[PDB]
C-alpha cells in the first residue's frame, strides 16, 4: 500500500475488493 495516503485512496478499492 501507499505511506503517505490511504483512506479514501488505494486500501479503498483493495479493502472492497479483497474484504467485502
Same mark, same amino acid.
Given at each position: 500500500? /501507499? #505511506? /503517505?495516503? #490511504?483512506?479514501?485512496? #488505494? ?6 475488493? /479483497?474484504?467485502?
Amino acid at each position: 500500500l /501507499v #505511506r /503517505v495516503a #490511504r483512506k479514501l485512496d #488505494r486500501y479503498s478499492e483493495y479493502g472492497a475488493a /479483497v474484504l467485502f
